[model samples]
Target: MNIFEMLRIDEGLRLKIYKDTEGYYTIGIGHLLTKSPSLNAAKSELDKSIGRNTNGVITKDEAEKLFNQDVDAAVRGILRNAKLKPVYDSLDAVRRAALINMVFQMGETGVAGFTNSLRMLQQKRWDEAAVNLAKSRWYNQTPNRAKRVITTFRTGTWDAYK
Candidate 1:
């Protein structure tokens, strides 16, 4: 097996997010990202989902429900965005999922900042759009998670580069 896979197994996965030894927000296979507005948005989404007006903790079940609700909305956003361009319909499921995942990670408004990449996607230039994605500041900040998407864009294969 790959050393990285072996290493991750040793790192220990947690279903719930928690602060590491250095006290940073982390979740899902030990992601170290803390600067994302996405984290706050997640809390907000969870609050809305569980009918809470005040901040509170969540169980894995609650978190999973929130995740499901959020992803559904994001995919719907992709469908709405897809309506703007006919060519989007012809792309394979993975490419479409990549776009949806972007919306899911950030938001529809955030995805709008990727104008050049969207333009490339508009013209059905998969690799070009992928390269554009890789070149962005987003790639620099979230290379670990984002590079997998970049690899998908660069080639229809998954490889981590961070």
Candidate 2:
């Protein structure tokens, strides 16, 4: 199932679905009850939010401006949902949650760029994938967060670290 299907609309934090000016359906996550923006707008807003939040490198205003020009490029850079689906679908629930954590932190493109890790996963080389994943700059720079996510991805359990 797609992300939209996986995260069904409900009370509390939820995904909002609506159409754009072009009539293409789009989805966003938030508590706000409003029409979803166009895919372009959604992508733009998400990138801006991510860029601003991930680090304090850019001011909110700057992020908003850069997002306007770069969202399309960023979205285009992401692996298609089709490409990501097989990997996600094959994962156990805990591994899926770990992957979601990785996606949330690294963004789709960052996750998709894991060439060696992807190959390891495709080969069912779980241990190797785990090792390679941990070797990333993401892991080195964010050890605590990386450890938490890698543990889940490796063992398919929240208690892996325990």
Candidate 3:
């Protein structure tokens, strides 16, 4: 099954999934959520929780110790919902995972804020898409990660990081 089907998520749950996955607590979109005073604690908590149960060997509580709920849910849900589809339909599994990871770190709005980037992707403008992706605010903030994802999106190839 697809990620969304596996998760049995609705729009509300989708939003929650994003929020919970991206645990920094920064407020945006239509809702306002509080920031975690201890970002490290939030991160730790989230690592264990967002993904599948993994046969009790992997548990949400264990991940939740490092990451926050919003961040965890966002990453997991977006990966579940969007992976290998839409803008990512042409991408490989590793590339798709990388893109989802970036979106999880940056938020959907942050990713969507790249209007020109989306346009490029929609138009099959590979070079333009790379440029647009590179120009994002988050791109500047996380240059290495952004470059790797943009490269994968542009070339439809797997990179070591993903």
Candidate 4:
């Protein structure tokens, strides 16, 4: 599956604001309102879209838009890192999507912490990369999603979507 489809499945769509696993205020496909620019801006945009205040709610279209923005930002963040750019570029499509999915869940800084894993990926050592990935607290926080991503990394296949 593509990065968008994989993220939609992993993050799930939520039009209303809710707490994420880490208790952050989030909405609209895992969009973190707390970390975002301003809730007022998002609320104002929602109000503009529906011609009324949504009262902390958004349309599916809005959620999709935010999802796209988040994904694009994640991709840009990854590519912007000189250390990661070459590693990401060396990957196949499925592995690339898996890397992006990891960055989507945990920001570029978080992904950058996996130094050995990144090295393994850069070296095309899939097994070592998967092993290093699983050893992280990220796997502990979201084992299911981590399993899927690690499998993709190890196999260089999109079979995790099945």
Candidate 5:
């Protein structure tokens, strides 16, 4: 499966505004609409997208637009990182998808913080990289999703696709 298909499953599309795991105002497929306790500044962006909210819901087409943009941002953000670009360039397609999905979840900065894991990945030490990934708080918070990513990294296959 492609990165977008994998993410649609992992993040789960929601047409209505809802509180995320950390209670942030999020919509679409994990598209964070607002970060504050209330809508605050980000509300206008959401409102404008849906053409003035209209009961806090967005059409499937609108959600697809956000998803496409967010995925592009994640891809660009990872490739733009000086530290990560080489690592990304060295990976196989499955492993590359794994890294992109990871960046989608935590942002480029968060994945870049996996210093040891990134080093292991760059060295083609798949087992060591997987171990380091499993040892993180990210693993603890979302063990199931983390397991799929780690397995993709270690095995360099689309085993997680099914």
Candidate 6:
């Protein structure tokens, strides 16, 4: 069966928000709510909806629209909140893509904190930058993605994981 169908069957439908097995607040057929109780606005919204429940009835179309909004917001953050905007802009299209992707994966602040790597990258010091990136927690978590991005950054070419 399709992925949505499978998830609906496995995860079941819940109209109201509740802490999931993993303790993440979720609603509407596995759509993890982005709102955090720490945010006052989120708290207010949750308070309004508290104890109200019926059917989590979700349409794949609504889910898709929500996902589109989610991704668009992420891209906008990458564009507007990029700390190394100058160096990020100076890169070729593929390299720019790689770094922006890293910003998304590691959070804008996390990638920006890569002072050494950014410095070397700005100087076109590919080898040193690669080494610097390797020392990152993100790199340790996903070696292949780091390697592909590094290779693409160095060669101005595309490399995909097999």
* Each model's lDDT: 0.57, 0.52, 0.49, 0.84, 0.87, 0.58
Task: For residues 45-124, write the lDDT of model 4, one tens digit per residue.
Answer: 55664566688888898888888889999999998997778889998988999989888888888888888899999999
Question: Model 5, residue 144: displacement in angstroms?
Answer: 0.9
Task: Name the better of 5 and 6 by lDDT.
Answer: 5
Ranking by lDDT: 5, 4, 6, 1, 2, 3
Question: For model 1, what is the alpha-carbon lDDT of residue 145?
Answer: 58
lDDT of 5 by residue, 69-159 (tens): 9999988998899988989999898889999999988888999899999999999998988988999989998888899889889998878
Q: Which ten residues in a row have the lowest lDDT in candidate 4?
A: 41-50
Residue lDDT tens for model 6, 70-125: 34554576567656786776777767766755654455777778888888888888
Local distance difference test, candidate 2: 0.52
| lDDT top scorer | 5
lDDT of 4: 0.84
Give the clashing residue pairs of candidate 2, or none: none
Error of 1 at 71 (Å): 0.8
Q: Per-residue lDDT for 33-58 in model 2, tens only?
A: 12454455555554455553322133
How much does candidate 5 score in TM-score? Answer: 0.92
Task: Assess candidate 6 and give its lDDT.
Answer: 0.58
Better of 2 and 5 by TM-score: 5
Candidate 2 vs candidate 4, lDDT winner: 4
Off by over 4 Å in 1: 1-48, 52-55, 82-87, 157-162
TM-score of 3: 0.51
TM-score for each prediction?
0.63, 0.50, 0.51, 0.88, 0.92, 0.58
Kindly report which residue stretches of model 4 are placed more than 4 angstroms away from their true locations once superposed.
35-52
Q: Which scores higher on lDDT, 1 or 4?
A: 4
How far residue 41's Cα lies from its native spot in candidate 5, in Å, is 5.4
After aligning candidate 6 to the native by TM-score, how far in Å is the CA of 111 from where it should be?
1.2
Model 6: how far residue 67 lies from native, Å: 4.6
| Alpha carbon lDDT at 94, candidate 3 | 49
Give the 10-residue window scoring lowest on summed lDDT in candidate 2.
Answer: 5-14
